[PDB]
Amino acid sequence: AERTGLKATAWKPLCKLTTELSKVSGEMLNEGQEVISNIQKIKAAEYKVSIYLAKNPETQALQQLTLLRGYFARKTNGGLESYKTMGLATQIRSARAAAYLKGSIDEFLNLLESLKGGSENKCLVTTNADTAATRRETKLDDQECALSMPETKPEAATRTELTQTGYPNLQHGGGGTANTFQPTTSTGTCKLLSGHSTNGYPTTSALDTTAKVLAGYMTIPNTQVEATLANMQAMGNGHKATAPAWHEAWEARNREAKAKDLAYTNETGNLDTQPTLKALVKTLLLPKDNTEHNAEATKLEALFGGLAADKTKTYLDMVDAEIIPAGIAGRTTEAPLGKIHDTVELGDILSNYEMIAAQNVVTLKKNL
Amino acid sequence: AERTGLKATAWKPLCKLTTELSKVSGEMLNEGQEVISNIQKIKAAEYKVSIYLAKNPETQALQQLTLLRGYFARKTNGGLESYKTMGLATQIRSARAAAYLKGSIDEFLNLLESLKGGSENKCLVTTNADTAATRRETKLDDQECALSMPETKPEAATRTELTQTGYPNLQHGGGGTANTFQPTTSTGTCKLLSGHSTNGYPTTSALDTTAKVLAGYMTIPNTQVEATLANMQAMGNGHKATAPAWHEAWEARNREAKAKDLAYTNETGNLDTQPTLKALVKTLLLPKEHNAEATKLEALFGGLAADKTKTYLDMVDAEIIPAGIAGRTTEAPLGKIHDTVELGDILSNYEMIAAQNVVTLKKN
Ligand SMILES: *[C@@H]1O[C@H](CO)[C@@H](O[C@@H]2O[C@H](CO)[C@@H](O[C@@H]3O[C@H](CO)[C@@H](O)[C@H](O[C@H]4O[C@H](CO)[C@@H](O)[C@H](O)[C@@H]4O[C@H]4O[C@H](CO)[C@@H](O)[C@H](O)[C@@H]4O)[C@@H]3O)[C@H](O)[C@H]2NC(C)=O)[C@H](O)[C@H]1NC(C)=O
Ligand SMILES: *[C@@H]1O[C@H](CO)[C@@H](O[C@@H]2O[C@H](CO)[C@@H](O[C@@H]3O[C@H](CO[C@H]4O[C@H](CO)[C@@H](O)[C@H](O)[C@@H]4O)[C@@H](O)[C@H](O[C@H]4O[C@H](CO)[C@@H](O)[C@H](O)[C@@H]4O)[C@@H]3O)[C@H](O)[C@H]2NC(C)=O)[C@H](O)[C@H]1NC(C)=O
């Protein structure tokens, strides 16, 4: 009916959504940290191969290891650039889109909760006009509904309330007298939900226009009908006009950069299909006057014994086993590269071996 | 004044604040971009010195350049780690804090704007009860008041509405019948602003309690008085209880990591006062007494003035990378090569040539 409260079938999905949205910022922190961690891990790999080369100038694996060092360098350096130029924006965009939409939901729900007055005024109701939802701490009846934003810390958010498709649990309809999301008359009423003057909010004159609230989701009529709830289940371009904050949280969520993305992970598949690897074969190893078709593939087979992805493994294993003795970079005890993961530490070790490598040349040249 | 509309003196500050908050996300994007940029600059310096060493093994500047190389590496690697562990959270925090607050403000302002109906219902008024503010695109009575969020793109926000101290332009007072933020009665009314049943919103019974709206800033009474506006000018711990979203945007804004912070910038001071530089003298250069690092630095650089590294850095910058290295088309000095991907390719190629040199010297 006109001007009864909103049923729990309509507001409980909003409580679920605000609960879900509350963790998006934190999930964006977590995802950013994992992106940076991945960049770091690839930098560490660059460093390990670099250190092995500096320590072992006479290696018989010079070309294989040069290639791999170059590969990891491109991947970490390009990854960090991609995070700056594209990735970080997606994560900030989604955190703020969720937070903006959540702020409007929380404000409107709070206002409806607050318009409770004796038997005659109740806006968040259960299944009839007379029974207000009961707040107990952060719950409204049995549904978590904390109209607050938590501390930003790493989180894993739920993915049921705002999916790839849209907002599947938000109800849609209303706008007549069917008692769909506002029950039949009894005693309690929520005049805010009608902009008509006989039984609704305004004095004497109806509202000049229908009102859009909940950032465009809900229409408050200026005629003697129920509020309308828009269809948010199948989101798309048209919501940019009718419900921009809802379209924006949806699209931003779908466009989040992930640590598992191509930009921030090692390439996969056969060696000649790893585009950074293949390009570096041509950059670092081929003569500039190479005349051959598929020269990169041929060189990779000559280097690694085939094109399967696991053909690099014995080389990376050799790097990992290499022991860095106590005394390099002030280190107290020996350790194999495979146990040293800290980028600052690895940077120090590389620095020390580049000096040692220069000293080696000077000594050689001195001996003649 | 019970149940008349809000004067422009009260709501225009809210418009100003939502306008300012609209750019906070984009400023945090810019800030994070500059942090990364600074980390990349230091990395580029790490690479240039490395490349110089790989190309010039007999340099008489070996110790100086090894130290600088090591310093840039600690700085850039430590910087990125600091951004992951501490900085990035500060920036996402502030973006989302501002956005959350803005979402509440925009929703409530929108509602007030929307409760306009004939001569008798007007909630955002000018200076009297009968004159509603006029919207013209993004402006309300000529004040910017776009109840929307822009695209997230790098930009700089204003700092007049949410300052280090608080919210200086938001009014405070109300709660009686002084006509302070709601004008004397005439024909227009805003019944939402009173929770008392004779002239205000609710039918028959007053609201059970006062209502807190605008995320705690505004109190709607359940007695025959004007709304109350909280004092938000000097923020502090008391606002945690009563206006937590306002406290959160304010503290988060204050705590933003900046690209100019110590974790993302070169050290300054006399050379012996630069703690990374000093530590590395011991890590990389010093065998095994008092002031040994300072003494070594002075000898290496010909003094301890901060600019005593400049000669070494200028020599690196001048080093030409000829066409043909790492597929490059043209020659350029290191000083004109800034792209970290390109620099990593250059180092890769020169370390291979360097190892080939050793193998040749040992053969001969
Ligand atoms: C931390 O500190 C490091 C070290 O200082 C920073 O790394 C250097 O960063 C700068 C970029 O900011 C980079 O490029 C130089 O930038 C200067 C302009 O901003 C230029 O002065 C310099 O160019 C000179 O040398 C070129 C190559 O020789 C010349 O072609 C050019 O014409 C300039 O030459 C003039 O200047 C020299 C010396 O003053 C003098 O002989 C004549 O006037 C000459 O005509 C570069 O483009 C450096 O390459 C970086 N240094 C290294 C060693 O990598 C890092 O950015 C800092 N980090 C942060 C966050 O600030
Ligand atoms: C891109 O790819 C590089 C190259 O693989 C990765 O760098 C390696 O990262 C690993 C894991 O941190 C480093 O540590 C060593 O891992 C080896 C196994 O690595 C593979 O399997 C793990 C688990 O699935 C993957 O996470 C990893 O990506 C690899 O696929 C272990 O075998 C090593 O231990 C062995 O060696 C030491 C010494 O010989 C012994 O003490 C052990 O008992 C054991 O025999 C070790 O744990 C490894 O050092 C890195 N390699 C190099 C060259 O740096 C990057 O992490 C990856 N980047 C991303 C984002 O995935």
PDB file of N, CA and C in Angstrom, chain A residues 25 33 40 43 46-47 69 74 77 81 84 96 100 103-104 106-107 110-111 116-118 120-121 148 150 152 191-192 201 203-206 208 212 214-215 288 348 351 354 365, chain B residues 25 33 40 46-47 58 69-70 74 77 81 84 96 100 103-104 106-107 110-111 116-118 120-121 148 150 152 191-192 201 203-206 208 212 214-215 324 345 348:
ATOM      1  N   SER A  25      37.439  -2.284   0.031  1.00  0.00           N
ATOM      2  CA  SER A  25      38.664  -1.483   0.205  1.00  0.00           C
ATOM      3  C   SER A  25      39.803  -2.336   0.654  1.00  0.00           C
ATOM      4  N   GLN A  33      48.845  -5.396  -2.608  1.00  0.00           N
ATOM      5  CA  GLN A  33      49.983  -5.979  -1.974  1.00  0.00           C
ATOM      6  C   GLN A  33      50.471  -7.220  -2.662  1.00  0.00           C
ATOM      7  N   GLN A  40      57.985  -7.944  -6.851  1.00  0.00           N
ATOM      8  CA  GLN A  40      59.145  -8.266  -6.002  1.00  0.00           C
ATOM      9  C   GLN A  40      59.763  -9.598  -6.188  1.00  0.00           C
ATOM     10  N   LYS A  43      61.588  -9.468  -9.431  1.00  0.00           N
ATOM     11  CA  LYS A  43      62.853  -8.749  -9.174  1.00  0.00           C
ATOM     12  C   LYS A  43      63.841  -9.621  -8.464  1.00  0.00           C
ATOM     13  N   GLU A  46      65.400 -11.850 -11.014  1.00  0.00           N
ATOM     14  CA  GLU A  46      66.362 -11.092 -11.741  1.00  0.00           C
ATOM     15  C   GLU A  46      67.677 -11.007 -10.990  1.00  0.00           C
ATOM     16  N   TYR A  47      67.571 -10.669  -9.705  1.00  0.00           N
ATOM     17  CA  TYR A  47      68.769 -10.518  -8.881  1.00  0.00           C
ATOM     18  C   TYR A  47      69.556 -11.842  -8.755  1.00  0.00           C
ATOM     19  N   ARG A  69      67.826 -13.729 -17.097  1.00  0.00           N
ATOM     20  CA  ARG A  69      68.021 -12.480 -16.320  1.00  0.00           C
ATOM     21  C   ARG A  69      67.292 -11.359 -17.017  1.00  0.00           C
ATOM     22  N   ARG A  74      62.707  -7.609 -17.640  1.00  0.00           N
ATOM     23  CA  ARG A  74      61.556  -7.044 -18.378  1.00  0.00           C
ATOM     24  C   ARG A  74      60.284  -7.233 -17.615  1.00  0.00           C
ATOM     25  N   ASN A  77      60.178  -4.974 -14.297  1.00  0.00           N
ATOM     26  CA  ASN A  77      60.204  -3.566 -14.608  1.00  0.00           C
ATOM     27  C   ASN A  77      58.942  -3.158 -15.336  1.00  0.00           C
ATOM     28  N   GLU A  81      55.742  -0.729 -13.963  1.00  0.00           N
ATOM     29  CA  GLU A  81      55.173   0.286 -14.820  1.00  0.00           C
ATOM     30  C   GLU A  81      53.706   0.097 -15.082  1.00  0.00           C
ATOM     31  N   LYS A  84      51.663   1.128 -12.088  1.00  0.00           N
ATOM     32  CA  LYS A  84      51.563   2.571 -12.022  1.00  0.00           C
ATOM     33  C   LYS A  84      50.586   3.153 -12.998  1.00  0.00           C
ATOM     34  N   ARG A  96      36.886   3.110  -4.039  1.00  0.00           N
ATOM     35  CA  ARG A  96      36.108   4.346  -3.831  1.00  0.00           C
ATOM     36  C   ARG A  96      34.706   4.193  -4.377  1.00  0.00           C
ATOM     37  N   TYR A 100      31.628   4.804  -1.997  1.00  0.00           N
ATOM     38  CA  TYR A 100      30.657   5.866  -2.290  1.00  0.00           C
ATOM     39  C   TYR A 100      29.225   5.344  -2.279  1.00  0.00           C
ATOM     40  N   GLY A 103      28.163   4.522   1.184  1.00  0.00           N
ATOM     41  CA  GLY A 103      27.800   5.716   1.988  1.00  0.00           C
ATOM     42  C   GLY A 103      26.394   6.144   1.758  1.00  0.00           C
ATOM     43  N   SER A 104      25.905   6.058   0.522  1.00  0.00           N
ATOM     44  CA  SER A 104      24.549   6.420   0.271  1.00  0.00           C
ATOM     45  C   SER A 104      23.551   5.393   0.810  1.00  0.00           C
ATOM     46  N   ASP A 106      24.038   3.423   3.367  1.00  0.00           N
ATOM     47  CA  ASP A 106      24.022   3.482   4.830  1.00  0.00           C
ATOM     48  C   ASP A 106      23.211   4.706   5.312  1.00  0.00           C
ATOM     49  N   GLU A 107      23.384   5.822   4.616  1.00  0.00           N
ATOM     50  CA  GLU A 107      22.689   7.066   5.022  1.00  0.00           C
ATOM     51  C   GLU A 107      21.176   6.859   4.872  1.00  0.00           C
ATOM     52  N   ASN A 110      19.872   4.271   7.423  1.00  0.00           N
ATOM     53  CA  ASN A 110      19.885   4.907   8.717  1.00  0.00           C
ATOM     54  C   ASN A 110      18.670   5.844   8.863  1.00  0.00           C
ATOM     55  N   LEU A 111      18.355   6.612   7.797  1.00  0.00           N
ATOM     56  CA  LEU A 111      17.264   7.565   7.920  1.00  0.00           C
ATOM     57  C   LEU A 111      15.941   6.775   8.109  1.00  0.00           C
ATOM     58  N   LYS A 116      11.108   6.267  13.252  1.00  0.00           N
ATOM     59  CA  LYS A 116      10.319   5.343  14.063  1.00  0.00           C
ATOM     60  C   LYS A 116       9.742   6.202  15.185  1.00  0.00           C
ATOM     61  N   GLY A 117       8.441   6.164  15.323  1.00  0.00           N
ATOM     62  CA  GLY A 117       7.762   7.021  16.250  1.00  0.00           C
ATOM     63  C   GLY A 117       6.422   6.410  16.661  1.00  0.00           C
ATOM     64  N   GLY A 118       6.373   5.915  17.898  1.00  0.00           N
ATOM     65  CA  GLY A 118       5.133   5.246  18.391  1.00  0.00           C
ATOM     66  C   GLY A 118       4.627   4.144  17.466  1.00  0.00           C
ATOM     67  N   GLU A 120       2.509   4.655  15.008  1.00  0.00           N
ATOM     68  CA  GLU A 120       2.106   5.207  13.687  1.00  0.00           C
ATOM     69  C   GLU A 120       3.243   5.427  12.677  1.00  0.00           C
ATOM     70  N   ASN A 121       4.495   5.357  13.092  1.00  0.00           N
ATOM     71  CA  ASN A 121       5.615   5.663  12.180  1.00  0.00           C
ATOM     72  C   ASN A 121       6.647   4.593  12.295  1.00  0.00           C
ATOM     73  N   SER A 148      28.336   1.257   8.937  1.00  0.00           N
ATOM     74  CA  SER A 148      29.648   1.768   9.254  1.00  0.00           C
ATOM     75  C   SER A 148      30.660   1.180   8.309  1.00  0.00           C
ATOM     76  N   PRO A 150      34.584  -0.464   7.999  1.00  0.00           N
ATOM     77  CA  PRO A 150      35.609  -0.954   8.914  1.00  0.00           C
ATOM     78  C   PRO A 150      36.992  -0.376   8.588  1.00  0.00           C
ATOM     79  N   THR A 152      40.634  -0.230   7.191  1.00  0.00           N
ATOM     80  CA  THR A 152      41.172  -0.784   5.966  1.00  0.00           C
ATOM     81  C   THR A 152      42.370  -1.653   6.355  1.00  0.00           C
ATOM     82  N   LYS A 191       5.600   7.731   5.892  1.00  0.00           N
ATOM     83  CA  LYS A 191       5.150   8.750   4.970  1.00  0.00           C
ATOM     84  C   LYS A 191       6.263   9.157   4.006  1.00  0.00           C
ATOM     85  N   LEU A 192       7.540   8.989   4.431  1.00  0.00           N
ATOM     86  CA  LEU A 192       8.670   9.399   3.584  1.00  0.00           C
ATOM     87  C   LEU A 192       8.553   8.696   2.241  1.00  0.00           C
ATOM     88  N   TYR A 201       4.246  12.307   2.747  1.00  0.00           N
ATOM     89  CA  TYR A 201       5.121  13.261   3.370  1.00  0.00           C
ATOM     90  C   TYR A 201       4.676  14.731   3.262  1.00  0.00           C
ATOM     91  N   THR A 203       3.031  18.544   2.829  1.00  0.00           N
ATOM     92  CA  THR A 203       1.838  19.296   3.195  1.00  0.00           C
ATOM     93  C   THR A 203       1.232  19.967   1.996  1.00  0.00           C
ATOM     94  N   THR A 204      -0.063  19.732   1.829  1.00  0.00           N
ATOM     95  CA  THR A 204      -0.926  20.380   0.784  1.00  0.00           C
ATOM     96  C   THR A 204      -0.643  20.026  -0.671  1.00  0.00           C
ATOM     97  N   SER A 205       0.605  20.154  -1.106  1.00  0.00           N
ATOM     98  CA  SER A 205       0.927  19.992  -2.501  1.00  0.00           C
ATOM     99  C   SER A 205       1.734  18.732  -2.533  1.00  0.00           C
ATOM    100  N   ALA A 206       1.536  17.916  -3.548  1.00  0.00           N
ATOM    101  CA  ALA A 206       2.419  16.782  -3.770  1.00  0.00           C
ATOM    102  C   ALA A 206       3.840  17.262  -4.141  1.00  0.00           C
ATOM    103  N   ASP A 208       6.806  18.106  -6.455  1.00  0.00           N
ATOM    104  CA  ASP A 208       6.772  18.544  -7.848  1.00  0.00           C
ATOM    105  C   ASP A 208       7.140  17.441  -8.859  1.00  0.00           C
ATOM    106  N   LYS A 212      14.240  10.384  -6.537  1.00  0.00           N
ATOM    107  CA  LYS A 212      15.135   9.263  -6.669  1.00  0.00           C
ATOM    108  C   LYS A 212      16.031   9.245  -5.463  1.00  0.00           C
ATOM    109  N   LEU A 214      18.396   6.367  -2.589  1.00  0.00           N
ATOM    110  CA  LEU A 214      19.291   5.207  -2.611  1.00  0.00           C
ATOM    111  C   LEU A 214      20.143   5.267  -3.884  1.00  0.00           C
ATOM    112  N   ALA A 215      20.679   6.461  -4.176  1.00  0.00           N
ATOM    113  CA  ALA A 215      21.517   6.687  -5.382  1.00  0.00           C
ATOM    114  C   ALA A 215      20.883   6.185  -6.682  1.00  0.00           C
ATOM    115  N   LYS A 288      72.309  -9.297 -35.660  1.00  0.00           N
ATOM    116  CA  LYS A 288      71.380  -8.295 -36.242  1.00  0.00           C
ATOM    117  C   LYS A 288      71.116  -8.630 -37.717  1.00  0.00           C
ATOM    118  N   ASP A 348      72.107  -5.956  -2.173  1.00  0.00           N
ATOM    119  CA  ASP A 348      73.417  -5.856  -1.535  1.00  0.00           C
ATOM    120  C   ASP A 348      74.396  -6.937  -2.093  1.00  0.00           C
ATOM    121  N   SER A 351      75.429  -6.032  -5.565  1.00  0.00           N
ATOM    122  CA  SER A 351      76.379  -4.912  -5.520  1.00  0.00           C
ATOM    123  C   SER A 351      77.809  -5.367  -5.212  1.00  0.00           C
ATOM    124  N   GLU A 354      79.263  -7.389  -8.235  1.00  0.00           N
ATOM    125  CA  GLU A 354      79.672  -6.515  -9.362  1.00  0.00           C
ATOM    126  C   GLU A 354      81.098  -5.853  -9.063  1.00  0.00           C
ATOM    127  N   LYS A 365      94.050  -8.325 -15.999  1.00  0.00           N
ATOM    128  CA  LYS A 365      94.787  -7.434 -16.869  1.00  0.00           C
ATOM    129  C   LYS A 365      96.160  -7.128 -16.345  1.00  0.00           C
TER     130      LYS A 365
ATOM    131  N   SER B  25      40.038  10.738  -4.306  1.00  0.00           N
ATOM    132  CA  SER B  25      40.450   9.496  -4.928  1.00  0.00           C
ATOM    133  C   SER B  25      41.480   9.683  -6.013  1.00  0.00           C
ATOM    134  N   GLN B  33      50.994   6.976  -7.868  1.00  0.00           N
ATOM    135  CA  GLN B  33      51.797   7.043  -9.118  1.00  0.00           C
ATOM    136  C   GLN B  33      53.132   7.712  -8.916  1.00  0.00           C
ATOM    137  N   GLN B  40      60.925   4.030  -9.166  1.00  0.00           N
ATOM    138  CA  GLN B  40      61.463   3.769 -10.511  1.00  0.00           C
ATOM    139  C   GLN B  40      62.658   4.652 -10.859  1.00  0.00           C
ATOM    140  N   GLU B  46      70.121   2.978  -9.957  1.00  0.00           N
ATOM    141  CA  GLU B  46      70.739   1.725  -9.720  1.00  0.00           C
ATOM    142  C   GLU B  46      71.248   1.059 -11.025  1.00  0.00           C
ATOM    143  N   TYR B  47      70.375   1.016 -12.018  1.00  0.00           N
ATOM    144  CA  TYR B  47      70.775   0.409 -13.287  1.00  0.00           C
ATOM    145  C   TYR B  47      71.876   1.185 -13.963  1.00  0.00           C
ATOM    146  N   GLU B  58      87.673  -1.334 -15.262  1.00  0.00           N
ATOM    147  CA  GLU B  58      88.931  -0.771 -14.771  1.00  0.00           C
ATOM    148  C   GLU B  58      88.823   0.619 -14.226  1.00  0.00           C
ATOM    149  N   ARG B  69      75.765   2.497  -6.281  1.00  0.00           N
ATOM    150  CA  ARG B  69      74.926   1.437  -6.839  1.00  0.00           C
ATOM    151  C   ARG B  69      74.199   0.708  -5.747  1.00  0.00           C
ATOM    152  N   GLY B  70      74.924   0.279  -4.730  1.00  0.00           N
ATOM    153  CA  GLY B  70      74.352  -0.340  -3.553  1.00  0.00           C
ATOM    154  C   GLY B  70      73.344   0.534  -2.830  1.00  0.00           C
ATOM    155  N   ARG B  74      69.338  -0.278  -2.332  1.00  0.00           N
ATOM    156  CA  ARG B  74      68.638  -0.330  -1.015  1.00  0.00           C
ATOM    157  C   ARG B  74      67.522   0.585  -0.966  1.00  0.00           C
ATOM    158  N   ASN B  77      64.598  -0.730  -3.468  1.00  0.00           N
ATOM    159  CA  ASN B  77      64.016  -2.017  -2.958  1.00  0.00           C
ATOM    160  C   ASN B  77      63.261  -1.830  -1.624  1.00  0.00           C
ATOM    161  N   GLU B  81      59.047  -2.068  -0.881  1.00  0.00           N
ATOM    162  CA  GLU B  81      58.605  -2.771   0.261  1.00  0.00           C
ATOM    163  C   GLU B  81      57.810  -1.883   1.222  1.00  0.00           C
ATOM    164  N   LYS B  84      54.315  -1.293  -0.224  1.00  0.00           N
ATOM    165  CA  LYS B  84      53.456  -2.495  -0.047  1.00  0.00           C
ATOM    166  C   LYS B  84      53.015  -2.621   1.413  1.00  0.00           C
ATOM    167  N   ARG B  96      38.879   5.807   0.254  1.00  0.00           N
ATOM    168  CA  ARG B  96      37.594   5.191   0.619  1.00  0.00           C
ATOM    169  C   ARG B  96      36.912   5.947   1.735  1.00  0.00           C
ATOM    170  N   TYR B 100      33.228   7.363   1.214  1.00  0.00           N
ATOM    171  CA  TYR B 100      32.157   6.903   2.096  1.00  0.00           C
ATOM    172  C   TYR B 100      31.388   8.105   2.644  1.00  0.00           C
ATOM    173  N   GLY B 103      29.473   9.814  -0.016  1.00  0.00           N
ATOM    174  CA  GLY B 103      28.214   9.104  -0.355  1.00  0.00           C
ATOM    175  C   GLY B 103      27.072   9.413   0.591  1.00  0.00           C
ATOM    176  N   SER B 104      27.390   9.525   1.884  1.00  0.00           N
ATOM    177  CA  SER B 104      26.331   9.949   2.823  1.00  0.00           C
ATOM    178  C   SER B 104      25.856  11.371   2.642  1.00  0.00           C
ATOM    179  N   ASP B 106      26.013  13.165  -0.098  1.00  0.00           N
ATOM    180  CA  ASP B 106      25.303  13.314  -1.364  1.00  0.00           C
ATOM    181  C   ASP B 106      23.892  12.762  -1.261  1.00  0.00           C
ATOM    182  N   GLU B 107      23.740  11.646  -0.590  1.00  0.00           N
ATOM    183  CA  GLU B 107      22.420  11.033  -0.451  1.00  0.00           C
ATOM    184  C   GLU B 107      21.484  11.953   0.369  1.00  0.00           C
ATOM    185  N   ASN B 110      20.725  15.174  -1.594  1.00  0.00           N
ATOM    186  CA  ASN B 110      19.802  14.814  -2.657  1.00  0.00           C
ATOM    187  C   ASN B 110      18.367  14.676  -2.149  1.00  0.00           C
ATOM    188  N   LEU B 111      18.239  14.029  -1.006  1.00  0.00           N
ATOM    189  CA  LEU B 111      16.902  13.884  -0.433  1.00  0.00           C
ATOM    190  C   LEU B 111      16.262  15.254  -0.123  1.00  0.00           C
ATOM    191  N   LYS B 116      10.712  18.917  -2.448  1.00  0.00           N
ATOM    192  CA  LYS B 116      10.229  20.183  -2.880  1.00  0.00           C
ATOM    193  C   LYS B 116       8.817  19.868  -3.474  1.00  0.00           C
ATOM    194  N   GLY B 117       7.806  20.589  -3.017  1.00  0.00           N
ATOM    195  CA  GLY B 117       6.433  20.334  -3.435  1.00  0.00           C
ATOM    196  C   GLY B 117       5.597  21.569  -3.264  1.00  0.00           C
ATOM    197  N   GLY B 118       5.323  22.241  -4.377  1.00  0.00           N
ATOM    198  CA  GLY B 118       4.544  23.446  -4.313  1.00  0.00           C
ATOM    199  C   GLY B 118       5.159  24.508  -3.439  1.00  0.00           C
ATOM    200  N   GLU B 120       4.553  24.885  -0.235  1.00  0.00           N
ATOM    201  CA  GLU B 120       4.595  24.497   1.177  1.00  0.00           C
ATOM    202  C   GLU B 120       5.717  23.567   1.578  1.00  0.00           C
ATOM    203  N   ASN B 121       6.455  23.020   0.617  1.00  0.00           N
ATOM    204  CA  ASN B 121       7.518  22.007   0.952  1.00  0.00           C
ATOM    205  C   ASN B 121       8.771  22.402   0.235  1.00  0.00           C
ATOM    206  N   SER B 148      27.575  13.593  -7.205  1.00  0.00           N
ATOM    207  CA  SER B 148      28.106  12.526  -8.058  1.00  0.00           C
ATOM    208  C   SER B 148      29.579  12.433  -7.813  1.00  0.00           C
ATOM    209  N   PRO B 150      33.268  11.788  -9.759  1.00  0.00           N
ATOM    210  CA  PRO B 150      33.933  11.774 -11.109  1.00  0.00           C
ATOM    211  C   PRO B 150      34.750  10.523 -11.329  1.00  0.00           C
ATOM    212  N   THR B 152      38.046   8.349 -11.757  1.00  0.00           N
ATOM    213  CA  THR B 152      39.224   8.342 -11.004  1.00  0.00           C
ATOM    214  C   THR B 152      40.393   8.547 -11.954  1.00  0.00           C
ATOM    215  N   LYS B 191       9.435  19.528   6.742  1.00  0.00           N
ATOM    216  CA  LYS B 191       8.978  18.739   7.896  1.00  0.00           C
ATOM    217  C   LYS B 191       9.959  17.626   8.280  1.00  0.00           C
ATOM    218  N   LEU B 192      10.762  17.148   7.339  1.00  0.00           N
ATOM    219  CA  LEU B 192      11.801  16.141   7.651  1.00  0.00           C
ATOM    220  C   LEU B 192      12.701  16.634   8.760  1.00  0.00           C
ATOM    221  N   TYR B 201       7.480  15.894  10.835  1.00  0.00           N
ATOM    222  CA  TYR B 201       7.310  14.676  10.000  1.00  0.00           C
ATOM    223  C   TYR B 201       6.276  13.686  10.452  1.00  0.00           C
ATOM    224  N   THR B 203       3.339  11.260  12.148  1.00  0.00           N
ATOM    225  CA  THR B 203       1.937  11.343  12.498  1.00  0.00           C
ATOM    226  C   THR B 203       1.702  10.918  13.954  1.00  0.00           C
ATOM    227  N   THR B 204       1.004  11.775  14.708  1.00  0.00           N
ATOM    228  CA  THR B 204       0.446  11.505  16.037  1.00  0.00           C
ATOM    229  C   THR B 204       1.507  11.415  17.149  1.00  0.00           C
ATOM    230  N   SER B 205       2.506  10.566  16.978  1.00  0.00           N
ATOM    231  CA  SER B 205       3.573  10.404  17.993  1.00  0.00           C
ATOM    232  C   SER B 205       4.825  11.009  17.475  1.00  0.00           C
ATOM    233  N   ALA B 206       5.576  11.651  18.340  1.00  0.00           N
ATOM    234  CA  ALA B 206       6.929  12.116  17.994  1.00  0.00           C
ATOM    235  C   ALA B 206       7.841  10.939  17.712  1.00  0.00           C
ATOM    236  N   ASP B 208      10.690   8.386  18.432  1.00  0.00           N
ATOM    237  CA  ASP B 208      11.037   7.809  19.734  1.00  0.00           C
ATOM    238  C   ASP B 208      12.328   8.425  20.322  1.00  0.00           C
ATOM    239  N   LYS B 212      19.999  11.094  14.099  1.00  0.00           N
ATOM    240  CA  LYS B 212      21.318  11.546  13.643  1.00  0.00           C
ATOM    241  C   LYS B 212      21.405  11.241  12.147  1.00  0.00           C
ATOM    242  N   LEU B 214      23.262  12.771   8.123  1.00  0.00           N
ATOM    243  CA  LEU B 214      24.526  13.304   7.578  1.00  0.00           C
ATOM    244  C   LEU B 214      25.703  12.668   8.346  1.00  0.00           C
ATOM    245  N   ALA B 215      25.614  11.343   8.499  1.00  0.00           N
ATOM    246  CA  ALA B 215      26.622  10.496   9.198  1.00  0.00           C
ATOM    247  C   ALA B 215      27.003  11.057  10.546  1.00  0.00           C
ATOM    248  N   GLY B 324      72.791  -0.488 -31.377  1.00  0.00           N
ATOM    249  CA  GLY B 324      73.169  -1.925 -31.433  1.00  0.00           C
ATOM    250  C   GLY B 324      73.109  -2.646 -30.098  1.00  0.00           C
ATOM    251  N   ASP B 345      67.363  -4.054 -20.001  1.00  0.00           N
ATOM    252  CA  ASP B 345      67.848  -4.730 -21.263  1.00  0.00           C
ATOM    253  C   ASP B 345      69.339  -4.376 -21.471  1.00  0.00           C
ATOM    254  N   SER B 348      71.536  -6.229 -18.981  1.00  0.00           N
ATOM    255  CA  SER B 348      71.563  -7.608 -19.399  1.00  0.00           C
ATOM    256  C   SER B 348      72.634  -7.760 -20.489  1.00  0.00           C
TER     257      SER B 348
END
